[PDB]
Design an enzyme around this catalytic site. Sequence first.
Site, short mmCIF file in Angstrom:
data_model
loop_
_atom_site.label_atom_id
_atom_site.label_comp_id
_atom_site.label_asym_id
_atom_site.label_seq_id
_atom_site.Cartn_x
_atom_site.Cartn_y
_atom_site.Cartn_z
N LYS B 76 45.55 -16.12 -113.96
CA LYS B 76 45.81 -14.79 -113.37
C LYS B 76 46.28 -13.88 -114.49
CE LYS B 76 49.51 -13.70 -110.75
NZ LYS B 76 50.44 -13.64 -109.58
N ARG B 120 50.17 -15.16 -101.87
CA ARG B 120 50.77 -16.45 -102.28
C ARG B 120 52.31 -16.34 -102.43
NH1 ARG B 120 53.77 -15.66 -107.13
NH2 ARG B 120 52.49 -16.09 -109.00
N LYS B 240 75.26 -13.21 -109.98
CA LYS B 240 75.38 -14.55 -110.54
C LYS B 240 76.24 -15.42 -109.65
CE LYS B 240 74.94 -14.23 -115.37
NZ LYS B 240 75.33 -13.61 -116.67
N1 LIG Z 1 56.56 -14.92 -107.92
C1 LIG Z 1 57.44 -13.94 -107.77
O1 LIG Z 1 58.67 -14.14 -107.82
C2 LIG Z 1 56.89 -12.54 -107.60
C3 LIG Z 1 55.51 -12.36 -107.40
C4 LIG Z 1 55.03 -11.07 -107.26
C5 LIG Z 1 55.92 -9.99 -107.33
N2 LIG Z 1 57.23 -10.20 -107.55
C6 LIG Z 1 58.17 -9.07 -107.64
O2 LIG Z 1 58.15 -8.30 -106.40
C7 LIG Z 1 58.77 -7.05 -106.70
C8 LIG Z 1 58.25 -5.94 -105.80
O3 LIG Z 1 56.92 -5.60 -106.20
P1 LIG Z 1 56.13 -4.40 -105.49
O4 LIG Z 1 54.69 -4.53 -105.92
O5 LIG Z 1 56.23 -4.40 -103.98
O6 LIG Z 1 56.82 -3.10 -106.16
P2 LIG Z 1 56.71 -1.63 -105.46
O7 LIG Z 1 56.89 -0.58 -106.53
O8 LIG Z 1 55.47 -1.61 -104.58
O9 LIG Z 1 58.02 -1.55 -104.50
C9 LIG Z 1 59.37 -1.84 -104.86
C10 LIG Z 1 60.24 -1.22 -103.76
O10 LIG Z 1 61.63 -1.53 -103.91
C11 LIG Z 1 62.43 -0.33 -103.87
N3 LIG Z 1 63.65 -0.55 -104.70
C12 LIG Z 1 63.74 -0.53 -106.05
N4 LIG Z 1 65.00 -0.84 -106.45
C13 LIG Z 1 65.74 -1.04 -105.34
C14 LIG Z 1 67.15 -1.38 -105.04
N5 LIG Z 1 68.02 -1.56 -106.05
N6 LIG Z 1 67.52 -1.52 -103.74
C15 LIG Z 1 66.66 -1.36 -102.73
N7 LIG Z 1 65.36 -1.04 -102.94
C16 LIG Z 1 64.86 -0.86 -104.19
C17 LIG Z 1 61.48 0.77 -104.37
O11 LIG Z 1 61.83 2.09 -103.94
C18 LIG Z 1 60.17 0.31 -103.77
O12 LIG Z 1 60.01 0.77 -102.43
C19 LIG Z 1 58.62 -6.82 -108.21
O13 LIG Z 1 59.95 -6.97 -108.70
C20 LIG Z 1 57.83 -8.03 -108.72
O14 LIG Z 1 58.25 -8.41 -110.06
C21 LIG Z 1 57.73 -11.45 -107.68
#
Ligand SMILES: NC(=O)c1ccc[n+]([C@@H]2O[C@H](COP(=O)([O-])OP(=O)(O)OC[C@H]3O[C@@H](n4cnc5c(N)ncnc54)[C@H](O)[C@@H]3O)[C@@H](O)[C@H]2O)c1
Lengths: 334, 334
Positions: B76, B120, B240
């Site tokens: 990916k 996923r 933490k």
């Molecule tokens: N395997 C994993 O752990 C995994 C996989 C995919 C994505 N992610 C994570 O998922 C997260 C979200 O991705 P997305 O595509 O939906 O991003 P996105 O930009 O579509 O949305 C993020 C949302 O969170 C809000 N936000 C930001 N900071 C905030 C806070 N402190 N409190 C409350 N709300 C807040 C934003 O306004 C926005 O609506 C990313 O951090 C990404 O790294 C993790």
Amino acid sequence: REMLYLNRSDIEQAGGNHSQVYVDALTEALTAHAHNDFVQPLKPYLRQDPENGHIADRIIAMPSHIGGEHAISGIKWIGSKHDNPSKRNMERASGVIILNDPETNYPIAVMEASLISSMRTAAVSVIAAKHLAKKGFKDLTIIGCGLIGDKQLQSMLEQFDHIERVFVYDQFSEACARFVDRWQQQRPEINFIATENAKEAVSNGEVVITCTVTDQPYIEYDWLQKGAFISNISIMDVHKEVFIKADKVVVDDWSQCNREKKTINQLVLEGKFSKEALHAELGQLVTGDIPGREDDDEIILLNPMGMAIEDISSAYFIYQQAQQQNIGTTLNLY
Amino acid sequence: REMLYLNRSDIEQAGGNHSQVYVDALTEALTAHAHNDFVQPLKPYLRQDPENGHIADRIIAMPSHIGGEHAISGIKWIGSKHDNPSKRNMERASGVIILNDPETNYPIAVMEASLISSMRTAAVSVIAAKHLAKKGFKDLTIIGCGLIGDKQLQSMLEQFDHIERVFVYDQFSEACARFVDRWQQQRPEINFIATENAKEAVSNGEVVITCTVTDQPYIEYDWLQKGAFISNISIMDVHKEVFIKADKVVVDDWSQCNREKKTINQLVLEGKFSKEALHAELGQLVTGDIPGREDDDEIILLNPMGMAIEDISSAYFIYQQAQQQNIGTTLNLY
Ligand SMILES: NC(=O)c1ccc[n+]([C@@H]2O[C@H](COP(=O)([O-])OP(=O)(O)OC[C@H]3O[C@@H](n4cnc5c(N)ncnc54)[C@H](O)[C@@H]3O)[C@@H](O)[C@H]2O)c1
Ligand SMILES: NC(=O)c1ccc[n+]([C@@H]2O[C@H](COP(=O)([O-])OP(=O)(O)OC[C@H]3O[C@@H](n4cnc5c(N)ncnc54)[C@H](O)[C@@H]3O)[C@@H](O)[C@H]2O)c1
């Protein structure tokens, strides 16, 4: 929104099949490399069976970013199975290059990878030789007659019209025979000699290019004529003594060569080599920061590990040319 | 020879749009992970501007191989720009997954990546909750209403029909408002509450899922009800103290979490956490090697970094289903 898909035929049709596009592309990328205007994380190897498995059985992820006027990102995802040609009549290597728009990081192209890879690898030899070979050299040696060897030979003949003879060796006699037969027809005014051993071939080259899949060196220092330049494309072929005895040692990327399990790193881990001992990185020759060959007696070694920016810059150039000629298949992302 | 190209619409049409395919796919991949039948090199981050640049500005290469009955390889290659939605009205993340036939290592599929990735990632929460949430839990909390939040919510509602209320918070009020409005219509028999702060949302969740882009924790331990399970999908949200005070801490992959610049590694680098302190890797719960939740008072944290085998297994499943329904575009490699 959209991505351009370019298969090998598309890449050929767009100019990918002539060394010049790769030479132009790498001259520019190697310039950006000397100016440190790029990012290039270490390339990780995926081996399905990491120790119980041949060393040409892997897939490598090669991401990079190049800054500048038309800044581009991307990855080469290139696989290999040692017995693809012998057992399946398939090319050993295969893969795709993805290009990404650095503004959005979105993918914008999906391209076949092995023609571009073999071609940029041949451009590396060409540009190195412009700086490190004796001017006017007449005798070229190719060791290993696979796809890499073929492309090295094609690009050298395209780019150096003073080459008169080509000495060829392959561990597999037949491979060599067909290769010289093919090429003697392609280029009749050039003399191709199928040699009986590696020593005969090496001994007779003013430029020596290694294109094998060995993991034990066979090239001795004393095979090398004064004034020889060796482009060690297949890496493992050259004995350690050569890195030590050569007047000048060039690499593409010092950080990428001083890896734990590498010949140079081993010489460094012992007390037999240092970064100070290194003559240049290739990009530094391209820019004129460090001089290339200084006399016709020097024996010069290039040890180039391969750099993602070479693939990405080459693919970007070909992508642009394809779009210019309306070549390829337009895909929707969504 | 050929590759199947599958865009997002193709992936949806082939079943990629229902949580069940991802749950089936990951149950199998997580099984192979517990049995160590996989290879998964560390995922390198390409940042065009590594320090002068937002932490959601990168492209990650994620190669992996999964052994077994139908062994598959792939990568990916997923990009991100923090201000894609705010400034360009584009999804933050984008990319492609390439699949490879482990016999030849040749590429066999090119697929859109972000739907599969978000899906996923939602399946991870679903499977974790099967093992770590209170049976019959009624109250779910989602923090962050982007694409990840949306998919987490969709998959939880698909997979747990006993959910009665959903508490939603987003730092951006408007984002939250539209999200609950949308979903209250999608699912009328479920009660969606737009909260005024993060504490209100967290305090009311029996399952709490973090879906933000923060890099400073805001979730305190004392917000958490006894019996809460928190799926910390967006990683940085949890203080933490929570890793320390939680009764059980689960990760997807311990080696991948004990990275130098990681919260867990920091707690380990101090004397505040060890591998012995870790309750389980997720795959170990799936296989029954280590038990999941043992009483309804335990506060349980899942910290899942994301694993390439999740993307590759999911994509392989969807690839097979597409080929079964003759979905997609056939490309020639050459
Ligand atoms: N395997 C994993 O752990 C995994 C996989 C995919 C994505 N992610 C994570 O998922 C997260 C979200 O991705 P997305 O595509 O939906 O991003 P996105 O930009 O579509 O949305 C993020 C949302 O969170 C809000 N936000 C930001 N900071 C905030 C806070 N402190 N409190 C409350 N709300 C807040 C934003 O306004 C926005 O609506 C990313 O951090 C990404 O790294 C993790
Ligand atoms: N950036 C780089 O440095 C770079 C880039 C691409 C490829 N390569 C290398 O190029 C090499 C050649 O690739 P290929 O696709 O042409 O492989 P290939 O299988 O097509 O051909 C290799 C040829 O070398 C011959 N050979 C093997 N061992 C030999 C020996 N000890 N002496 C003489 N001949 C021998 C084989 O019979 C075969 O004809 C590979 O080692 C690959 O890793 C390097």
